[PDB]
């Protein structure tokens with residue numbers, strides 16, 4: 001019932017972020033949601049003496065029909081003080097990514113039970129815009145911990161920790177991790193046993209006074225990894241050998257003792273691209289040596305929590321996408337590949353938006369934070385469409401790559 | 413006495429760190445002082461200002477200005493200093509409605525709310541900062557000290573607080589009368605409906621009855637304001653809208669300023685006048701700043717202007733929005749990176765028109781530009797109607813599919829249909845995915861000397877064909893492109909090209925159909941002429957055969 005005081009960072013003001021255009025149906029959804037939230041006292045109307053703003057929009061979560069209000073607190077989050085708590089940062093649970101099954105719960109509605117520090121409320125200002133600026137935008141600010149705000153799980157933590165005790169001490173091997181409005185619950189049980197334990201956890205929140213019914217299930221133990229592989233052929237063309245050497249030259253930035261000399265020697269003279277070149281013994285051995293090298297992991301690869309995680313994505317065609325997460329160039333912490341047909345057979349941007357969400361989810365499970373994406377798409381195209389396909393309650397950072405990377409097919 | 417609800421005051425603060433203004437009052441004439449005293453006495457009688465003691469250390473200079481050589485003075489309190497020190501507000505004026513988004517209104521009434529303004533009290537704790545001083549006759553008495561009780565005209569917070577106070581009052585009236593629209597612009601309230609004029613006039617008297625509850629009267633006469641309304645550069649008619657008259661001046665000589673004014677007028681006209689062009693007129697203001705500098709018009713720019721004059725010859729109107737009907741956007745390519753579009757519901761009845769200009773860039777293609785135009789129109793349409801229109805595009809379905817399935821970037825165009833009106837957007841070449849059997853293989857390379865700028869470009873092929881061309885005033889990148897150009901020039905309709913230039917591949921994989929570089933453009937023209945081109949990349953200096961740095965090393 002008591003508000004913990006919150007401040008912004010030194011010499012930082014609140015966010016003044018433009019509200020972007022919303023479709024009529026999202027505007028209606030928000031009017032209805034915010035109307036009821038105002039009744040429940042979670043939000044209140046504000047006057048023109050509040051010049052702050054944070055963008056808002058509406059989404060539909062994975063496999064439901066009910067609209068969810070999503071606030072883009074990215075600016076407020078990076079402007080809100082480094083929230084040291086009594087957790088000091090719960091050191092990210094390394095065992096979560098080893099669990100046979102992980103279920104994701106939306107527990108954001110719990111936040112609304114805790115009031116927000118009065119002097120900070122102004123900074124949670126948002127606007128429901130009208131179509132064509134025909135009526136004044138409806139302005140609101142939060143009276144309680146808002147969903148999507150970094151300070152919300154931070155503050156609610158002590159409340160959450162004691163709600164969990166009966167369940168946790170009962171189930172000492174189950175790992176539970178909180179990120180934003182999400183709860184990650186991983187065990188090594190049977191799906192029906194696991195699902196029951198999650199239900200033995202949901203009702204167990206409904207009992208503690210608290211779409212928590214929804215369940216997103218992952219299987220970390222069987223997650224996508226990617227070694228570098230070279231072709232195995234009985235007949236090599238000049239072109240095949242040229243492509244192999246290009247790939248090895250690139251891999252030599254990652255792996256030290258990669259050699260291409262003997263393979264290059266097969267390319268001497270000016271030969272037709274389609275001409276078959278029989279491999280010498282020196283060339284085959286060199287290829288074999290390289291192949292063995294590509295089995296050993298990369299040298300000097302460590303995660304540093306003080307650094308940003310970087311995620312690159314390449315479009316490989318046919319609904320296929322490759323990605324790599326790293327902090328240092330040529331020091332990949334994670335690589336993967338997607339082909340998921342999630343209602344986007346004819347929509348590149350929808351596929352990318354989903355790839356982005358899946359990669360962020362993986363990154364939260366493994367390191368406990370979201371990577372910064374480098375997206376193979378024009379900004380204007382991405383900015384126009386991603387909200388139509390977005391189903392998560394968090395939003396990562398992204399930049400745009402406008403020059404086609406050569407390394408695309410080396411990941412396919 | 414009929415009790416009236418008080419208008420709730422807005423808590424105003426100074427910017428943090430800042431104190432109120434302390435600006436010295438100007439010496440005035442005895443003539444002005446008498447005038448100012450008389451004015452400030454009337455205002456004080458009205459409750460707008462109050463006399464204050466000597467405790468208040470704040471001051472804002474007051475002025476007296478002769479109204480149009482009459483025998484009447486007007487007052488001016490200069491709040492620039494206080495405005496510098498006053499907090500930012502939520503300005504609600506940001507973004508004006510676009511007329512094409514509006515619905516037609518049978519009846520639209522204008523009410524004056526200039527008087528309601530003074531029923532909006534200024535935050536009590538802030539009033540002290542509004543202090544001003546009328547100097548005394550001959551400075552032989554203390555100046556008269558006043559402060560504001562109402563929103564001062566010219567004060568930073570006045571428009572936003574007035575607007576938001578009016579909105580809060582009107583809110584339950586608007587909510588319970590969903591068959592009318594209410595829009596405030598300055599001292600005017602516009603009330604519109606599609607109601608029978610009797611039923612409409614009822615709502616108006618009802619609105620007056622509602623405003624009375626806060627002691628607000630709305631003169632009740634007949635404003636000199638019947639349709640069309642002149643508003644924000646538009647003409648709002650009952651059943652149509654258009655821009656205010658566009659008049660392009662006759663001139664024998666144009667300066668930088670004249671052209672800016674010209675483009676600005678054309679940009680404004682482009683929202684309803686279809687096909688308006690501004691590239692050749694805009695590409696003259698490129699790097700200048702001297703507004704007086706008389707710029708000569710290119711023959712290309714005088715042709716664009718004459719075309720515009722013909723388009724501006726006829727008045728054109730847009731229709732209002734009908735939510736029951738569909739929303740359709742059609743785009744045409746104009747050339748020189750220019751695109752024009754119309755948005756309509758019924759054929760030959762545009763809601764509005766518009767244009768899109770190619771971005772700043774080294775290389776581009778029509779498909780990318782069309783995509784950008786689509787995105788822009790999509791966003792504008794969502795702003796104006798809250799929905800994406802259906803598109804009619806001068807591009808074949810097969811062409812788009814080929815494009816997006818093979819393009820290295822993710823790209824998307826919302827629901828659309830091919831419209832067969834030339835010039836059609838197409839792909840001008842398509843590189844091979846595999847080496848071509850039977851086709852000659854060209855190994856190309858270029859190199860240049862940083863100091864001398866001397867370079868070489870050339871090729872060696874599997875058939876023993878060879879060329880090295882010596883080049884002056886060049887770079888490594890130019891020689892790499894030149895080498896590829898030569899290979900295309902000297903090969904048959906099918907050719908394999910091997911290069912080590914990551915630079916040249918970065919460009920060509922971007923699939924441009926036009927470039928700033930004339931060298932890239934010649935390469936493009938060659939590709940268009942070929943039947944099949946396979947471009948392969950290899951790392952430099954790895955001893956890959958054919959890859960002949962040696963003919964270029966020298």
Ligand SMILES: COc1ccc(Nc2nc(Nc3c(C)cc(/C=C/C#N)cc3C)nc3nc[nH]c23)cc1
Nearest residue numbers: 509514515517593595602604639641643648649650
């Ligand atoms: C004859 O002029 C008009 C004016 C407005 C409309 N339609 C609509 N207007 C508004 N708000 C509004 C109003 C009532 C008047 C003006 C003119 C100001 C001046 N001068 C401007 C606006 C924006 N809201 C609407 N919503 C649906 N149709 C609408 C139709 C014809």
